[PDB]
Amino acid sequence: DICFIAGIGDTNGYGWGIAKELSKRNVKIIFGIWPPVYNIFMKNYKNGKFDNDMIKMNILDMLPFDASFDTANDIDEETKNNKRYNMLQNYTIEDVANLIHQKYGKINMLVHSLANAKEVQKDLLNTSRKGYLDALSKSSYSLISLCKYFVNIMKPQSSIISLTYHASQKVVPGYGGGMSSAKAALESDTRVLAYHLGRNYNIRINTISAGPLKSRAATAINTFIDYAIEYSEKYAPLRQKLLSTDIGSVASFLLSRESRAITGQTIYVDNGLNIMFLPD
Amino acid sequence: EDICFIAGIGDTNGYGWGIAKELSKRNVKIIFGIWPPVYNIFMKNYKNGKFDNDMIIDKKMNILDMLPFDASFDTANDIDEETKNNKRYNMLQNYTIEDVANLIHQKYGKINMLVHSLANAKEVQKDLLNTSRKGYLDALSKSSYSLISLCKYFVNIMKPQSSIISLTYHASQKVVPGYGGGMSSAKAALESDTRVLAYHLGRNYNIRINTISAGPLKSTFIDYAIEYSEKYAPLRQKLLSTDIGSVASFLLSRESRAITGQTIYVDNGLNIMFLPD
Amino acid sequence: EDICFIAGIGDTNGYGWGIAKELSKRNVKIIFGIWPPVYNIFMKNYKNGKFDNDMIIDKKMNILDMLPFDASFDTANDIDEETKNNKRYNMLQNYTIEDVANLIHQKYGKINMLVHSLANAKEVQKDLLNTSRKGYLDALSKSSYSLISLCKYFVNIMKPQSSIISLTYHASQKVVPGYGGGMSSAKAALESDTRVLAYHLGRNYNIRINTISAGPLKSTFIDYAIEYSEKYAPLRQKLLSTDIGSVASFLLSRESRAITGQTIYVDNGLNIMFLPD
Amino acid sequence: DICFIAGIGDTNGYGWGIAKELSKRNVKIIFGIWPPVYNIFMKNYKNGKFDNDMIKMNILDMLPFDASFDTANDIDEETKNNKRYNMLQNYTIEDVANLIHQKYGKINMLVHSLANAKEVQKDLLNTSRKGYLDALSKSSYSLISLCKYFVNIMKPQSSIISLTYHASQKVVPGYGGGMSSAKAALESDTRVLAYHLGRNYNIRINTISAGPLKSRAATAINTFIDYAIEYSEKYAPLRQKLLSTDIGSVASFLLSRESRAITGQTIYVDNGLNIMFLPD
Numbered sequence A, D: 001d002i003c004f005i006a007g008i009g010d011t012n013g014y015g016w017g018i019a020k021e022l023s024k025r026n027v028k029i030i031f032g033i034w035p036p037v038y039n040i041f042m043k044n045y046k047n048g049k050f051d052n053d054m055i056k057m058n059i060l061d062m063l064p065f066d067a068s069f070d071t072a073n074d075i076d077e078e079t080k081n082n083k084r085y086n087m088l089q090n091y092t093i094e095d096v097a098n099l100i101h102q103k104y105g106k107i108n109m110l111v112h113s114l115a116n117a118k119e120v121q122k123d124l125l126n127t128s129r130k131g132y133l134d135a136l137s138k139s140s141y142s143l144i145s146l147c148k149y150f151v152n153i154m155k156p157q158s159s160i161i162s163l164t165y166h167a168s169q170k171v172v173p174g175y176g177g178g179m180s181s182a183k184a185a186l187e188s189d190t191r192v193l194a195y196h197l198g199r200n201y202n203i204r205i206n207t208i209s210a211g212p213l214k215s216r217a218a219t220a221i222n223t224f225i226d227y228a229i230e231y232s233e234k235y236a237p238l239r240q241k242l243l244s245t246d247i248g249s250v251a252s253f254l255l256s257r258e259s260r261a262i263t264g265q266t267i268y269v270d271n272g273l274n275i276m277f278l279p280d
Numbered sequence B, C: 001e002d003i004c005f006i007a008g009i010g011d012t013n014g015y016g017w018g019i020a021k022e023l024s025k026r027n028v029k030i031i032f033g034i035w036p037p038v039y040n041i042f043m044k045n046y047k048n049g050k051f052d053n054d055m056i057i058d059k060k061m062n063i064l065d066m067l068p069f070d071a072s073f074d075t076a077n078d079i080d081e082e083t084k085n086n087k088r089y090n091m092l093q094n095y096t097i098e099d100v101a102n103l104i105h106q107k108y109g110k111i112n113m114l115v116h117s118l119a120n121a122k123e124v125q126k127d128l129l130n131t132s133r134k135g136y137l138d139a140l141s142k143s144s145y146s147l148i149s150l151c152k153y154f155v156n157i158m159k160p161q162s163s164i165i166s167l168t169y170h171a172s173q174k175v176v177p178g179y180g181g182g183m184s185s186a187k188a189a190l191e192s193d194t195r196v197l198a199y200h201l202g203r204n205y206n207i208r209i210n211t212i213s214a215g216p217l218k219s220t221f222i223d224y225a226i227e228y229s230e231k232y233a234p235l236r237q238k239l240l241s242t243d244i245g246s247v248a249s250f251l252l253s254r255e256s257r258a259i260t261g262q263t264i265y266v267d268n269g270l271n272i273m274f275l276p277d
């Protein structure tokens, strides 16, 4: 059992919570880390910062990974030469697939745990074409392409999950930049992918619609997350605090053979908030 | 020590059984609630060892008890004289929803898992337009309200962070000609009630409730459904009662503590398709 | 010459009226079906001119007839002796669903528009978990099965390409605490049945059926709903009974010939929101 | 009553059916026409080809329009110089808005009736990043931007509609190139837009999920439409043939004041096919 986790940058997000829970079932974890935060994440690892947070994880490997790039030929010269990518290799999608396959053979688990939008702070009406396409490229297409290259290094009857948010289905003002659009496309693509992957590969794919968690990404939005969290803890059917390991144990289930008959689905792990119409 | 009450088994050929089997792997103690008119037959078969092969898990299914259980009666007060006189029922007692909760609580204490696994529609063969008021309401009574009454009465005998599931079918959401008698209507109400119940039980007791929308299991038209499913579903493998079982087991465990009010599809992904390919 | 039967009016303060008004603009002849216990009061008020202002369209609403109509009885056969004896009912006749279809057909011939605009739940004040089996099934009987029985009996007296609508509410799909007694369950069943009925009626009679999910109209918690709606809905204007009326008119016309089996939201867009802003 | 129809190229699609139905209610129609097909469409108009099809429409104007371009500054040099754009002016989104406002003042109706995807023939898994982003840019973002520039030349209480397809919600193999993704994003964006447009502008926006129609675009897909049409006519609850004027009269209703309380909605005009699970 080996899982590649694409999109972890610290211990405060869903990626880490998923890693933690998979470790409990003795799953081998490989981190794919965005080069802008790659070095600091490494430094904190060896300097034992995450030691309190790993309570012990089985981290097979930690690789540079940028889901903007499908192959080495896609890397633009500027990025190629950038201070933070300098200096790094094999971080495209095709490249990490190959690298992982060489080091470890075929894997059976894949987690898409990333999203990005340059103009998330703008509302949809005010988002540029460029910002909107960026959101879809990094948050949605990246999943499709992740699948395309990893299906060849995955066995049957492997499993894939991604993370989404209810703003795709119902209006959440402030979730801007085309992020709502990107989540809607990703939830749709999850179905279409589940069809092709199931038929041709006997591989499963689902997505988890998570509730609010105060992560790096969540703060990128101009107190929105604080309100989100506070509103959820007040109005959700379940009033417990939502933890990243709550999503993690659900991710672990979806990735395991116990969920062998579930595919193409959007599964809500949000203390039930999604079921509410009117505040209390 | 976890205990699960499974309401609605009649043989080892349905979802209830598949759910019992998977739960047993987690060392969950099982209590069966069985429709009185087939209770004695079931006990006989069980005694005659007909289920021995079905019970093997190198682990035996630990069946704590098997009780007569009728989802159409809420309390002793609701038993009509015609069933009181009735052959089968005459030699059985304490089979109303409240009576069974009291029995279980008395004999074994509080439980923490509840499975609603039962449906009945006396006119399931007639299409909706030709279903009588009597047939429709019977369908709703047995298949939908029974869930609410189960929750009403079993919540008092459940631990906090307990979990509840029922079984539903996609005919509630999309048209399946042949799934008649108001069974579609009953499933739609059940999925809606699952949300409303999730709010109440969640806020007032910290108890979760979800429903599993299952693909076809041979437990006529069922042969069509199964064939069509196996031809057109994203996943080619045969859908097993234990495929639903392992999902049920997870929803009933604390691994799913943040999931409630949901309809979870366990159907090889058939629900996602629009047109045959 | 188009004729629409509107089942479920009691005053000029609800959706039924708003729908009658808008249809009148299209020169549709209106027949009202009125719950017997308020039939006489309604006739009196109508006679005493209490509705004259409400009827102005420089066009008068053309009310072809007003008949007693009870959605809980399918045929003369279903009338229980307690209602037979009953004060109000005693002096009225032919108010069962089949009886009214026969009357209308006899007096006026075939119609081509049908509106189901009625809901009743005797325990609407209790939350779902505390609703009795009796209260739940009453809700389903009056609010959901009544639609099926209406279609069953009125289809024989309708022209081809006729059209049918009912009224529903979003509590079926998302939790609205306070909308109790199984009204949420009833609405969920009604929206599902609308699809199943659309298939049967569409294939067998080329008749369409849809439902309108309406926002709140003051016709307690309703004051909350209306206030919340007017604060948080995408559209600020007040939701009028005639906002539902004009949508109903369109769904009942041939302009919507390719729309059937749908739940159409007329609620200022409130349904699309997740969190208050 | 003036309506701008963005995305008509002949009389065989939904745009024309919508034009026809709006004319019946005495609405003034302005066509926005993709420059690749602009000249031939004009030529056929004056050469009376469409005369049989206009049975008489009130065509206020016919303008070159390319929804790929938000402003003149967005036009790339090659396109600017292309044989078919040569030669044409004011065809960006900002430009047609301005032009229409100068000629006619403010309008009250807008129809987004276009879609495009370079790789529609490929299935999702095999779509490139570039193809996928093209689909979203032309089919989805174009609506957002159309709204952004037209809201200023529209009165309250104006109305906007677009066209979508059920492949966003359920799997339709063969609807490739990210078109499924684009429709899912567009249905989501319709909600988010309905919120901002309703609150700030008292303007409505909805989308029509249409059934199959043998149009130019529909044939671009590698007999798929023929099967679609044939399957729908066999299995839809309503077995009448679906006409472009069936959508048109629904479009007319949504655009009119009769639908003043409907917004953010996906309305199915498809003889009811969407409600079916199992074939007959």
Ligand SMILES: NC(=O)c1ccc[n+]([C@@H]2O[C@H](COP(=O)([O-])OP(=O)(O)OC[C@H]3O[C@@H](n4cnc5c(N)ncnc54)[C@H](O)[C@@H]3O)[C@@H](O)[C@H]2O)c1
Pocket (backbone or CB within 6 Å): A006, A007, A008, A009, A010, A012, A013, A014, A015, A033, A034, A037, A065, A066, A067, A068, A112, A113, A114, A115, A116, A138, A163, A164, A165, A209, A210, A211, A212, A213, A214, A215, A216, A217, A218
């Ligand atoms: N936090 C929430 O409230 C919440 C709610 C619902 C869904 N989600 C989803 O969960 C997922 C994880 O987000 P999170 O909340 O854990 O924040 P996070 O910051 O912990 O995770 C996002 C990670 O993705 C990485 N990343 C961004 N762009 C990348 C690229 N081009 N290549 C590779 N890596 C890149 C970042 O380094 C970052 O660490 C996201 O898909 C998000 O949309 C989050």
Ligand SMILES: NC(=O)c1ccc[n+]([C@@H]2O[C@H](COP(=O)([O-])OP(=O)(O)OC[C@H]3O[C@@H](n4cnc5c(N)ncnc54)[C@H](O)[C@@H]3O)[C@@H](O)[C@H]2O)c1
Pocket (backbone or CB within 6 Å): B007, B008, B009, B010, B011, B013, B014, B015, B016, B034, B035, B036, B038, B069, B070, B071, B072, B116, B117, B118, B119, B120, B142, B167, B168, B169, B170, B213, B214, B215, B216, B217, B218, B219
């Ligand atoms: N089999 C399928 O293809 C399928 C698909 C979707 C959903 N389901 C659902 O799964 C659940 C279990 O059914 P199944 O398919 O396993 O068949 P099953 O026979 O195993 O389960 C139904 C059981 O309910 C019991 N029952 C009937 N009336 C009762 C009453 N008044 N009181 C108590 N119990 C009563 C019967 O004894 C029967 O054994 C049902 O709720 C059904 O709607 C089944």
Ligand SMILES: NC(=O)c1ccc[n+]([C@@H]2O[C@H](COP(=O)([O-])OP(=O)(O)OC[C@H]3O[C@@H](n4cnc5c(N)ncnc54)[C@H](O)[C@@H]3O)[C@@H](O)[C@H]2O)c1
Pocket (backbone or CB within 6 Å): C007, C008, C009, C010, C011, C013, C014, C015, C016, C034, C035, C036, C038, C069, C070, C071, C072, C116, C117, C118, C119, C120, C142, C167, C168, C169, C170, C213, C214, C215, C216, C217, C218, C219
């Ligand atoms: N008002 C709202 O906020 C709202 C919102 C969503 C849906 N609805 C729906 O609109 C429909 C009309 O209700 P309304 O809000 O206009 O109030 P209303 O009083 O105008 O309509 C309900 C009518 O149904 C009649 N009725 C009750 N029991 C009956 C029976 N057994 N037989 C025949 N008729 C009976 C009553 O006389 C009553 O006048 C209902 O179906 C309701 O569920 C209302």
Ligand SMILES: NC(=O)c1ccc[n+]([C@@H]2O[C@H](COP(=O)([O-])OP(=O)(O)OC[C@H]3O[C@@H](n4cnc5c(N)ncnc54)[C@H](O)[C@@H]3O)[C@@H](O)[C@H]2O)c1
Pocket (backbone or CB within 6 Å): D006, D007, D008, D009, D010, D012, D013, D014, D015, D033, D034, D037, D065, D066, D067, D068, D112, D113, D114, D115, D116, D138, D163, D164, D165, D209, D210, D211, D212, D213, D214, D215, D216, D217, D218
């Ligand atoms: N035909 C169907 O079966 C069907 C079904 C559901 C939805 N739809 C939708 O209806 C809408 C109209 O499509 P149709 O089927 O009528 O085909 P169509 O070819 O008649 O309409 C598409 C038009 O959009 C124009 N267009 C394409 N790219 C453009 C750009 N960059 N700028 C401006 N114009 C551009 C084309 O010139 C073309 O005339 C589309 O959104 C389509 O997705 C069609």
Ligand SMILES: Oc1cc(CCCc2ccccc2)ccc1Oc1ccc(Cl)cc1Cl
Pocket (backbone or CB within 6 Å): A114, A115, A116, A117, A118, A120, A164, A165, A172, A173, A174, A175, A179, A211, A212, A213, A217, A218, A220, A221, A224, A225, A228
């Ligand atoms: O996909 C999500 C969803 C949430 C929930 C936030 C809820 C909320 C409510 C109002 C305003 C903002 C956010 C938080 C973070 C998140 O991931 C995001 C969003 C945006 C970017 Cl650019 C990156 C990432 Cl990782």
Ligand SMILES: Oc1cc(CCCc2ccccc2)ccc1Oc1ccc(Cl)cc1Cl
Pocket (backbone or CB within 6 Å): B118, B119, B120, B121, B122, B124, B168, B169, B176, B177, B178, B179, B183, B215, B216, B217, B221, B222, B224, B225, D278
């Ligand atoms: O809830 C379900 C769902 C299915 C799925 C297949 C049923 C089907 C499929 C196609 C056509 C007709 C019927 C099968 C059985 C089932 O349980 C049913 C249905 C009806 C009654 Cl009266 C009781 C039970 Cl336990």
Ligand SMILES: Oc1cc(CCCc2ccccc2)ccc1Oc1ccc(Cl)cc1Cl
Pocket (backbone or CB within 6 Å): A278, C118, C119, C120, C121, C122, C124, C168, C169, C176, C177, C178, C179, C183, C215, C216, C217, C221, C222, C224, C225
């Ligand atoms: O079907 C509906 C829907 C609403 C919408 C508001 C109701 C509401 C909102 C918030 C809290 C509680 C109730 C109001 C009235 C209504 O009709 C009802 C409801 C209940 C019964 Cl017994 C009859 C009828 Cl005619």
Ligand SMILES: Oc1cc(CCCc2ccccc2)ccc1Oc1ccc(Cl)cc1Cl
Pocket (backbone or CB within 6 Å): D114, D115, D116, D117, D118, D120, D164, D165, D172, D173, D174, D175, D179, D211, D212, D213, D217, D218, D220, D221, D224, D225, D228
């Ligand atoms: O949005 C749609 C939807 C349909 C319905 C086609 C149904 C179908 C089924 C199987 C395969 C292909 C198409 C047809 C055309 C259409 O518009 C499209 C689609 C793709 C492009 Cl590139 C352009 C346009 Cl205008």
